[PDB]
Design a protein around this nucleic acid. Structure first.
Ligand SMILES: [Mg+2]
Ligand SMILES: [Mg+2]
Ligand SMILES: [Mg+2]
Ligand SMILES: [Mg+2]
Ligand SMILES: [Mg+2]
Ligand SMILES: [Mg+2]
Ligand SMILES: [Mg+2]
Ligand SMILES: [Mg+2]
Ligand SMILES: [Mg+2]
Ligand SMILES: [Mg+2]
Ligand SMILES: [Mg+2]
Ligand SMILES: [Mg+2]
Ligand SMILES: [Mg+2]
Ligand SMILES: [Mg+2]
Ligand SMILES: [Mg+2]
Ligand SMILES: [Mg+2]
Ligand SMILES: [Mg+2]
Ligand SMILES: [Mg+2]
Ligand SMILES: [Mg+2]
Ligand SMILES: [Mg+2]
Ligand SMILES: [Mg+2]
Ligand SMILES: [Mg+2]
Ligand SMILES: [Mg+2]
Ligand SMILES: [Mg+2]
Ligand SMILES: [Mg+2]
Ligand SMILES: [Mg+2]
Ligand SMILES: [Mg+2]
Ligand SMILES: [Mg+2]
Ligand SMILES: [Mg+2]
Ligand SMILES: [Mg+2]
Ligand SMILES: [Mg+2]
Ligand SMILES: [Mg+2]
Ligand SMILES: [Mg+2]
Ligand SMILES: [Mg+2]
Ligand SMILES: [Mg+2]
Ligand SMILES: [Mg+2]
Ligand SMILES: [Mg+2]
Ligand SMILES: [Mg+2]
Ligand SMILES: [Mg+2]
Ligand SMILES: [Mg+2]
Ligand SMILES: [Mg+2]
Ligand SMILES: [Mg+2]
Ligand SMILES: [Mg+2]
Ligand SMILES: [Mg+2]
Ligand SMILES: [Mg+2]
Ligand SMILES: [Mg+2]
Ligand SMILES: [Mg+2]
Ligand SMILES: [Mg+2]
Ligand SMILES: [Mg+2]
Ligand SMILES: [Mg+2]
Ligand SMILES: [Mg+2]
Ligand SMILES: [Mg+2]
Ligand SMILES: [Mg+2]
Ligand SMILES: [Mg+2]
Ligand SMILES: [Mg+2]
Ligand SMILES: [Mg+2]
Ligand SMILES: [Mg+2]
Ligand SMILES: [Mg+2]
Ligand SMILES: [Mg+2]
Ligand SMILES: [Mg+2]
Ligand SMILES: [Mg+2]
Ligand SMILES: [Mg+2]
Ligand SMILES: [Mg+2]
Ligand SMILES: [Mg+2]
Ligand SMILES: [Mg+2]
Ligand SMILES: [Mg+2]
Lengths: 46, 62, 103, 77, 94
RNA sequence: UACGGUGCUGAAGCAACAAAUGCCCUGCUUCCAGGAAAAGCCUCUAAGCAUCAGGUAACAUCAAAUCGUACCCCAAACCG
RNA sequence: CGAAGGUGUGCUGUGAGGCAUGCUGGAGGUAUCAGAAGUGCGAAUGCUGACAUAAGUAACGAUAAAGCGGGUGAAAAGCCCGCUCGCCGGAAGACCAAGGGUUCCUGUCCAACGUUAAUCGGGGCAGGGUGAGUCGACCCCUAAGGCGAGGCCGAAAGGCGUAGUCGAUGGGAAACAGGUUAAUAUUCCUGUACUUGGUGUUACUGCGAAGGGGGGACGGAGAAGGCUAUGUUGGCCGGGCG
RNA sequence: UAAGGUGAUAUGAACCGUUAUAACCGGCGAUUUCCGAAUGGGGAAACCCAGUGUGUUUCGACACACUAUCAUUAACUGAAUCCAUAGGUUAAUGAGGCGAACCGGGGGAACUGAAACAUCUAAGUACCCCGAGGAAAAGAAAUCAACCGAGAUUCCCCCAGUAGCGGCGAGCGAACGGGGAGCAGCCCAGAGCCUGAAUCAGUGUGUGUGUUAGUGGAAGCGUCUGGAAAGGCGCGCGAUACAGGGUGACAGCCCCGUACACAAAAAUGCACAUGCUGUGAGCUCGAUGAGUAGGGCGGGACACGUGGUAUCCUGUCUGAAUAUGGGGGGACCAUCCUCCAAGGCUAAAUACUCCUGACUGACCGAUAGUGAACCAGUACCGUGAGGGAAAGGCGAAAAGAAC
């Protein structure tokens, strides 16, 4: 069957990447939460 | 060598800096093969380039 | 400000060699010394073909705590604790007994 | 933004109270109107999004007094 | 003109290989490990000065580093840059 | 001949017929449901430029960087 | 001259318990009388870990299929070599994009991984391998759309949008054949080309845009005609005479 | 400060140093790639593509600097449109972003409780948003009181679960007054007169006191057991040091410290002192915050749910007196008392701990304690936001088992 994860790096980075998070206000609050939690990988972006 | 290199001109330190970097190249190609068997020379040249670069920023622009 | 230094002759205060003497061969950064000819262990040295070691039961010296040794005072023939004073503006060591400067 | 430029009035929030006193949050909007005011000294019209209270203030203080305050406030007009 | 200070930092090492030994004897091409930001003109200027030899053309490729496991901890070697420097005919180099 | 290979040499190398869903064809015919945009490219002049700049023409010379290039890819390497 | 803990034994109290001691253990323990409690577990389809059970049972992943000889090896149904057999062949062959990211090639290893063994492997370990003016990206250009100076709007956050600026999945210059590596090739080599920019001379002289125009530049279906890829047969050349 | 060094796993190699630029520690410096507010334009973060200027060139090309946006100011420029203005271009200064809690403000739930539920409660709570500071806020009476008086604000203990509020249900809950902590007042609505006079700010210097490396630092032997003494048994000794830790078993006297005594080239805090810069000080005569107070309507805040409801805030419509005047004293009026709104500023007591140092615990001791004693916000899971583990101990010393 066709499963729900059909990967595409272009669509992965436009939707969840670094500059897509820094574009909006709430996305900047997402990166502030992950830095407060202390994430190694701060975003998707390789 | 901080006392010795301080008693030099700007053109003399620039001459010396160009002579250190050729030695750093010649050690690196020698250490690229198994020819270099004095490993401390790589560190001594690299430190001495830093002393020349330090004094150039002191005598010029400071 | 180290009391026991390299070329010093020490006596051993505690351990399996309580009373033996020797010269310090080197002091280690962990607060241990290797005194020449005292704390002998027998290491089963494994052979290496490269490096040309035949491999045997090598007897060599093990480290010992600096607290377990004291500088032998050759005048009194005993151990003395080491104090520090300034002579001619230079920090020297001296024996706590009889106040003589260690040389 | 529903802000009178002269008086600084602003939409405040309150309650609709019913007969059974059911409270739902509402807003009180100010009575703002865009009006061209003739400035006689500068000899031009100036549009101000002003409440009807502020037009009573301009009729009392004068448009020269109010535009002095808007520059002292640091507000464009 | 490429500055003389940069040209000493371009070349890292010669690369010894079975392919490097083949290219030296057949196509007369040496294989160099170069600095990663070094371009083809910087390599051609460096080899023509620091080795005193006439360069015909320089082909470059980036070697991606392998992923190794020291003990159980994962790790990745560095990406490095590799240059096939074809000398002109008659020219010779150690 | 390391049985993997490597080296050397090398003939003939035409015709007929059949033939695509490929090409001419971004064609042609026809229909109604009436079938992207912008640049490269071509051309026209504006201010400007006046024998200078630029223009095309030939020749010579130089430059064409950087990044990707392995391998699977209807699959044991992708999503399960 | 052996603490706590562990494991026994003997004794003792009405009970929760207590005491003594053997062995293990190898460094803490604590009377009494008070004080304070994260103070007592068998159950909560409790939580976590460990180990049972069914049980050496079911199963070992397409009914495309194997057989033998030789090799290697501690050991070969599975690896390698050979000869047969069978299966796919509009694919179960070949080339990519997407995606993965060294799985590629070579040496070496067989614990774990592989639903068995394994000398084998997409497994471990070490080394090697990806070469471009023409392929692709970048770049020039725009679509849907996104962002958006000012601006307009909105309690705040922000929403929408102009000039713009992004955004391919579409438009835009140019390389083929042969050879070669254990592994790359339209990238290396041999041969033969091509394109666009620079500068520089020589001849020639209306050049110039953010503007005007042209072009790019476009649908579905259908009908033939001309071809080629490619195939068949003949000829040709080489070999064969079972 | 030093006789030993070249961070860790982690040996080894090659070396450095031993009386002082070996190393190490501290102060001030130097360098400080790329991404990120990211700021030259772009972008799928760690990449792509420029422009301008000044320099170099072995003419192939290199190096360096600058170029975001907005606010404010200034210069220059500049439409429709005459002047003008909008607009444009420079320049200068500033801002942007991040961060635990505390603070002020703009918005603002529901589950729940009421044994249902709508007023009410939860609760101005969670959350979102904005702004700020080391604290913020508030603050110098149009305040209380009661005919006696008090004398800004904030905080703590009372008053008191009282007075009240409330489908008078559930609940909500003061103030006056008293005891404390802490205490500080000023300025503009304006002129003169005297002129730099107070205080504060800034910037120097000087002194003191810290902070950022450090230095000295007392006094024990014998014997017994044991692998090992710090234990046992003797016999001494120090103590302004018996805090603590380490050392082969439990050490005042072996070691590191501790008590105590000191120490800073340089940087810096805080105090003083003083110089300079700016700032005005005092006296006199005035002046005394209008679309405001009040009102109508609709809401909100006050413990006070519109009630007989004072007082405060304002969306809307109005609208005074103005010191001979006005506000308040809980409907309202009169008398009396008290105060002066519609302009501002202000330390302390108060709140909090991302972080640093020291110390403490009838706190935990690896299923506990942080999720994490260990390379943990990791492995792993998820498109993503997000979720999120497991896993400590050889010995005194590797003497980690030659053969
Ligand atoms: Mg409600
Ligand atoms: Mg080539
Ligand atoms: Mg390339
Ligand atoms: Mg390939
Ligand atoms: Mg296939
Ligand atoms: Mg499959
Ligand atoms: Mg025992
Ligand atoms: Mg216990
Ligand atoms: Mg027991
Ligand atoms: Mg026991
Ligand atoms: Mg103990
Ligand atoms: Mg319990
Ligand atoms: Mg149990
Ligand atoms: Mg029970
Ligand atoms: Mg249970
Ligand atoms: Mg089971
Ligand atoms: Mg079983
Ligand atoms: Mg059965
Ligand atoms: Mg059965
Ligand atoms: Mg079966
Ligand atoms: Mg099967
Ligand atoms: Mg066989
Ligand atoms: Mg088989
Ligand atoms: Mg076979
Ligand atoms: Mg691998
Ligand atoms: Mg393979
Ligand atoms: Mg292999
Ligand atoms: Mg086996
Ligand atoms: Mg197996
Ligand atoms: Mg492998
Ligand atoms: Mg191309
Ligand atoms: Mg657009
Ligand atoms: Mg805007
Ligand atoms: Mg928009
Ligand atoms: Mg574009
Ligand atoms: Mg495309
Ligand atoms: Mg294209
Ligand atoms: Mg291949
Ligand atoms: Mg056009
Ligand atoms: Mg068509
Ligand atoms: Mg044909
Ligand atoms: Mg026959
Ligand atoms: Mg080391
Ligand atoms: Mg940028
Ligand atoms: Mg940008
Ligand atoms: Mg661009
Ligand atoms: Mg409710
Ligand atoms: Mg209820
Ligand atoms: Mg304040
Ligand atoms: Mg009175
Ligand atoms: Mg000391
Ligand atoms: Mg001492
Ligand atoms: Mg000791
Ligand atoms: Mg013990
Ligand atoms: Mg007024
Ligand atoms: Mg007043
Ligand atoms: Mg009033
Ligand atoms: Mg009013
Ligand atoms: Mg009223
Ligand atoms: Mg009202
Ligand atoms: Mg009113
Ligand atoms: Mg006042
Ligand atoms: Mg835990
Ligand atoms: Mg345990
Ligand atoms: Mg846990
Ligand atoms: Mg993931």
């Amino acid at each position: 069957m066709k499963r729900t994860f059909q990967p595409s790096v272009l669509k992965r980075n436009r939707s969840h990447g670094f500059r897509a998070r820094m574009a909006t206000k709430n996305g900047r609050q997402v990166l502030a939460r992950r830095r407060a939690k202390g994430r190694a990988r701060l975003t998707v972006s390789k | 060598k901080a006392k010795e290199l301080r008693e030099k001109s700007v053109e003399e330190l620039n001459t010396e800096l160009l002579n250190l970097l050729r030695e750093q190249f010649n050690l690196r190609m020698q250490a690229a093969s198994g020819q270099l068997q004095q490993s401390h020379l790589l560190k001594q040249v690299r430190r001495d380039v830093a002393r020349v670069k330090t004094l150039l920023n002191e005598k010029a622009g400071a | 400000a180290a009391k026991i230094r390299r070329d010093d002759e020490v006596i051993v205060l505690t351990g399996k060699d309580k009373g033996k003497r020797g010269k310090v061969k080197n002091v280690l950064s962990s607060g241990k010394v290797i005194v020449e000819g005292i704390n002998l262990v027998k290491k089963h040295q494994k052979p290496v073909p490269a490096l040309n070691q035949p491999g045997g039961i090598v007897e060599k010296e093990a480290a010992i705590q600096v607290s377990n040794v004291a500088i032998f005072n050759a005048a009194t023939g005993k151990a003395d604790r080491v104090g520090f004073r300034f002579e001619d503006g230079k920090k020297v060591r001296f024996f706590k007994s009889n106040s003589e400067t260690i040389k | 933004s529903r802000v009178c430029q002269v008086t600084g009035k602003r939409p405040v929030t309150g309650n609709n109270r019913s007969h059974a006193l059911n409270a739902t949050k509402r807003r009180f909007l100010p009575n703002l109107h865009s009006h061209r005011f003739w400035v006689e000294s500068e000899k031009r019209f100036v549009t101000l999004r002003v409440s009807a209270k502020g037009m009573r203030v301009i009729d009392k203080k004068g448009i020269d007094t109010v535009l002095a305050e808007l520059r002292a406030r640091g507000e464009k007009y | 003109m490429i500055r003389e200070e940069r040209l000493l930092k371009v070349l890292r090492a010669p690369h010894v290989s079975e392919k490097a030994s083949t290219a030296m004897e057949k196509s007369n091409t040496i294989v160099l490990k170069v600095a990663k930001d070094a371009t083809k003109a910087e390599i051609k200027a460096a080899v023509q000065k620091l080795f005193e030899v006439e360069v015909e053309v320089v082909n470059t490729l980036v070697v991606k580093g392998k992923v190794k496991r020291h003990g159980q901890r994962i790790g990745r070697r560095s990406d490095w840059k590799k240059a096939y420097v074809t000398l002109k005919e008659g020219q010779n180099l150690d």
